[PDB]
């Protein structure tokens, strides 16, 4: 046991012992990534790692939004990494400081969530409207355990009442799941937020950035790594790694690099520690403009490559061929965000979000999702403005869809054959803006740039055991993994908090560090936040109006409050409003 | 008793005592083969022989693969011999110091095992699909005795059930069995590797040396021989050996040789030990190339007409027409291996075997079964490279296919006639390589060398007890018989186990060596091995999952479960899984 | 998992890679016992080790027999060390090599085992005569886990039936066993030498040095490490050793020791190997002549007190006080050995075990046992002569005596209070010597010294788990328990086998040593095995004899022999002489 969990304020405030023979030991980290930039974070506050010994390899030499960074108040590694790095906008302040001081004087709730017929709310918007089998499949997914899922998708473990109740259009969308997807990661994903199923539907349990997380995330520990001599070598493409895997242990020996077009090698020992975030969902990453579509790829990049080479040496270095190929053709492939500064356009987006697009505060509270679309479009307006030289009277919007392979509504193409204008033409004709201005508004008026990410929905895609390879894997010495296709415990992917976590778990086991990793929360197993969750599942319901149709139900109910009449269950069910 | 068997560590680095009257005795040795160096080398260490009375017979004056050389750790003999032999590749260290630190570093196992459907991985690979009569005939086929399974094939013994299993695909191609063999042979190769059936299908238990086992095995003897001043005589072509049958002994008095084309004798005494390799399983081997096939024959050699001389002057020095006369067409004749730096046809081996051939480690960890080839073709690579002088972009494939009077898939001639590339051809379209593309890879991008052994199934036979000679025939004074044709106790022939433990024991008991010779593993006599059998057997279950339908099985099982409850036994069932 | 156990041929010969660090780790080894040179010799021989880094702490500044160190063939880690150890006696030798020269040229066996009635031979010699109760209670004991044998005596598992046989006459006579000891460690001794009933009472299947052990084994061993240079540090008096117990990982961080009165401190870091010989058979004996008495005594000693210290800072050290506190007083205390040359008690002894004691070759094959001695006096003569200065003319035999308290037949005396010559006295009184020169024969024709060990049976009391530390304690990185009070897996204390087999399992787990231990040989997973055990307990009986009165056995023989007709397993009990 190189590691184990805790929770509380015990080890959340506590420092470690620095580590056993750290002195010699180097480290050596491929990519820039959030992942691996968190490792690095981490090996210089907890691993007391001198600066000089950390490389960081870069595959790059010395308006775009890639929304869905959604944040909440239990990323517990995210809060624990993001403490000892100041900020880079106010003085005397950590990361944590400006984020837990913007998040509660202008809390994210959205006034608006689902809109149809070309503008109009939905009727039902709020309520889940799950029926009594949805919620018994619901709870049938989170009480099966994760081995007896291996292989399995969305539909396969629910039906057709599921997905014709809003509680699937929000799951969706918030998550951009698919129906063939994994259902070991929706599964995670339901008992991680069991406890943020009443701020689901209006999204007030979500907390955002000032910014996009590259500048409010990336660039302060980029920031922090400089301050502390991190040495950055760029222009470097990793081939492969040379690993000897004996029946004792695993060792890297050596990379292949290519140093500025020249092919050369790193020697490794087994004090130089080595982390790999092996794939990406932003590679291969095709760009378009106002005018032209964002031609489709499927070519596999630098960290797909790297994770092929490295599977091929070991079993237990996990599958990548389970992530980065047959990808189906209707998962989301394109992305578009669009920024205009255009007045009826954002009077309309004002008509419909019931709040002002420039007043630099909370616009839509999230993502607004167009149930009508063929698209299945979704758009989310953030604090304007998110970034830093974007004139103050511009909005920038984020547009994504779901399916990639249909026609549109407006417009008889796909997503994938559309230019920019055309993206920003379908979604005008779903903002209720009519169709004889909405033409010009898109081509002259707002600026929309698409881009086609193939493997923007790769961490969903259905996995077995032992397809993402262990964060630190059995018997190793100086390997690991990190990023969103590394396999850690009751974590859900996708999510600032995975990269952290994963970062976290490879420096803690890697160097011995002999502190509690923060576990995944406990909101599954709280008495407390499983009777809210029933109370919120089912359009905020008594028992008594829950079991008021069944009678087996209805007679098992009555013998349960005959036996906790006037106990502290009975307090516990008033004080939960389900009594 | 002229010998004795022993296990365990005070007979296994114990010295003998230098044997009497050897001073007085010399050695002649009939072939340059694996169990002629290792009698030689026995004669040397164990015998205290000096070089210069022991000589070495060998027909020939002063990239080709020989494969299906799988090795495992319980070759007990082998061990025992590669000890004292130095290795010619790392200095300070024997044969057994670098295999063993080289399966160590490098674990061989197989990530894909049977393919078909040109390409596509067998959906029940890895599971045996042992059908409950399947199993039951496999028991009784190990529960049978040697003494009634003589002239018994595998036919007769099994049924349908067995044939469709998954087992007997991996069975008939590791050991290149055909359902006209031996009962006896394959009821002594189940008993053998009763304890590697867990690591049967990944080949996990076998171990490969760095090349092939002329260079990592007969060239260092070679040289081991050399050092101790060995007499190394060629072109000698061996005739007949005068044996006169007494009543009470039997004594070899001349040989009939053909020295350098001339026919001279030499004379021999009592202390003149012979050892004789009888019969050859590479014996009138036609060659082939890439643009003609390797003509068949049916020429008895040197090997064999050694054989049928000496078993004319004796009943009890055994019956080699057995072996070498009447094998059928449709056996094992044919094997090619495929020698290529083209790039897309090492892509698809990687694509397949998920490993890089150019990696210099474990590239198919083992064989590759084609099920829906008509020739039953099954090909292998392996560490790459398999030669000394061969460039580092090259990799050397092993091709053979049991079934040989059949038309191929993707041509339609027998494997018999067609020629290098036609080899090659139907490779490529096993590996699903498109059909357009298939030709000029073979004939141009690639060289295949077709061999045609006649005699490459002869081990496998169809015999009875006395058909093979004993080690040392009864009441003989210097004549041995060695190599894969000597009959011994529990051994599995085709093993270079077998013909190191007919060197071992034609060594010690001409000599009277009294050291124990290491016995067969006593694997099949283990109540700790037999319980993990049961287990792998039927597809990893447990003792209730087994008997769950049989209801003569249940009520036996539930009595058995009552006599074990809170014992050791019941110890021994939980922790090898069964319970 | 830092260490993993084997068997058979591969691992045997197998040397392995020098570890990991080794050149900046050093070694302290406290006592110079049996097994704390055997730790030293494999630092030197597998871990690579320089001698100079490697300390033996040794209490002591720069005719006894210490009887009962039987051998046999299968002490595998004792042959795997005594293999590199040469000899002294003879040139280009090992120890195992003149050991298995000498036990090949001159067997071990008795001829005679018990006598009673003053002299005569036990009728009922070599038989057993085991009841079907007394079988039945040996297969439950067999049969029952080792975790349910917590703290249970010999006399809770055992019958009346038992004790009356004489298979627990040679029992508890071989091994010194009492009816008040440890049923687990007898349950051990069962099972390890289940493959040598057969040789059981006639000692065929002992094997014994030329010597003692001192000079045969412990003799060698210093030189072979006075060879490599290793430093034996003495007049050192270990009075504890500073552990800190982390929750991750505990290390040795100093030793207090009295280095020649003088109390000073030796520091230790993580690579300071520290091994630790907890408690002593041999501490606290006091000596007698031939005319006094050995003084009884309770003193603990140097051994007993440090594991005493060490076993308060932490639980998992063992408990040493279910060892050297409360023994009782009917135990084995006081052994004597008698030498002389007179013609007439040798002539009796001769009369006896029907062999020349002055031969030069094996004596009495062991032990003789008297049945109708009240202390239960057993006394052996080896190959004479033990010693080396000892005259041709003189022999030297071992007395020891199991009850203690308990007045003798000639002398109405316990042992604990008869001088030397009294013990030689009620000796000969045994060995027929008539009643008129007993008395000057003792006092003048012989020279008997007692010695009063008051642990020589403390490696037998009762004890649970977790009472012996385990040879390697868990998360411990610097320190090592060695000897007989270490607690490993299916070996069996009071053995030279378990010191040795301690001392290889705490250097290969410390210095992580990727070689396989030897496990403890499979004789009781035997099929082979348990068919020889059971036609040799119950007196060398088929199983219709067996089985010939109870009618419920006679039922389900006759059912066996039905379903195993014309099969292996017949022919497996037929050559068991079971059929």
């Not at 349990?205 to 980029?222: D, G, H, I, R």
Request: charged content about 25%.
């Amino acid at each position: 046991s190189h590691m184990y969990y805790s929770y509380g304020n015990y080890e959340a405030f506590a420092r470690p012992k620095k580590p056993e023979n750290v002195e010699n030991k180097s480290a050596y980290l491929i990519g820039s990534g959030l992942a691996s930039l968190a490792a690095a974070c981490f090996l210089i506050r907890d691993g007391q790692m001198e600066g000089s010994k950390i490389h960081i390899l870069e595959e790059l030499p010395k308006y775009v939004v890639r929304g869905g960074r959604e944040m909440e108040n239990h990323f517990e590694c995210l809060w624990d990494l993001f403490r000892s790095i100041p900020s880079l906008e106010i003085d005397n302040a950590s990361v944590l400081d400006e984020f837990y001081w913007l998040n509660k004087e202008d809390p994210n709730y959205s006034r608006c969530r689902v809109i149809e017929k070309q503008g109009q709310r939905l009727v039902t918007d709020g309520d889940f409207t799950l029926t009594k089998t949805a919620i018994k499949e619901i709870l049938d997914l989170c009480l099966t355990n994760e081995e007896d899922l291996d292989d399995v998708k969305i539909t396969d473990v629910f039906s057709d009442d599921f997905f014709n109740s809003n509680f699937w259009i929000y799951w969706k969308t918030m998550f951009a799941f698919e129906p063939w997807h994994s259902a070991m990661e929706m599964r995670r994903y339901l008992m991680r937020f069991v406890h943020h199923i009443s701020g689901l539907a209006d999204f007030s349990a979500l907390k955002f950035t000032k910014y996009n997380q590259y500048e409010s995330l990336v660039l302060p520990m980029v920031e922090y790594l400089k301050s502390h001599g991190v040495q950055f070598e760029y222009d470097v493409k990793v081939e492969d790694i040379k690993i000897d895997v004996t029946t004792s242990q695993k060792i890297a020996r050596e990379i292949l690099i290519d140093r500025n077009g020249n092919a050369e090698s790193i020697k490794l020992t087994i004090n130089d520690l080595v982390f790999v975030t092996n794939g990406s969902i932003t590679e291969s990453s095709t760009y378009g403009d106002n005018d032209t579509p964002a031609p489709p790829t499927d070519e596999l990049g630098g960290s797909w490559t790297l994770w092929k080479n490295l599977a091929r040496q070991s079993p237990e270095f996990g599958n990548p061929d389970k992530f980065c190929q047959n990808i189906p053709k209707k998962s989301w492939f394109v992305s578009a965000t669009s920024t205009t500064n255009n007045k009826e356009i954002i009077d309309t987006i004002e008509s419909i979000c019931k709040r002002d697009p420039l007043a630099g505060k909370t616009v839509t509270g999230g993502i607004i999702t167009i149930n009508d679309s063929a698209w299945q479009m979704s758009f989310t307006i953030n604090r304007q403005q998110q970034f830093k030289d974007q004139p103050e009277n511009e909005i920038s919007t984020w547009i994504y869809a779901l399916y990639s392979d249909v026609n549109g509504d407006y417009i008889k193409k796909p997503i994938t054959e559309c230019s920019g204008n055309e993206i920003c033409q379908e979604w005008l004709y779903h903002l209720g803006v009519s169709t004889d201005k909405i033409e010009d508004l898109a081509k002259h008026a707002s600026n929309t740039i698409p881009v086609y990410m193939p493997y923007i929905t790769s961490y969903f895609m259905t996995r077995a055991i032992g397809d993402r390879p262990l964060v630190v894997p059995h018997q190793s010495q100086n390997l690991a993994f990190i990023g969103n296709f590394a396999e850690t415990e009751r974590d859900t992917v996708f999510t600032t908090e995975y990269s952290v976590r994963t970062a976290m778990e490879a420096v803690y086991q890697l160097l011995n560090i002999d502190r509690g990793i923060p576990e995944v929360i406990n909101s599954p197993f709280d008495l407390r936040v499983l009777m809210d969750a029933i109370y919120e599942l089912n359009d905020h319901q008594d028992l008594r109006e829950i079991t008021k149709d069944s009678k087996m139900q209805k007679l098992a109910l009555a013998g349960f409050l005959k036996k906790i009449k006037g106990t502290y269950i009975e307090s516990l069910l008033k004080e939960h409003k389900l009594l």
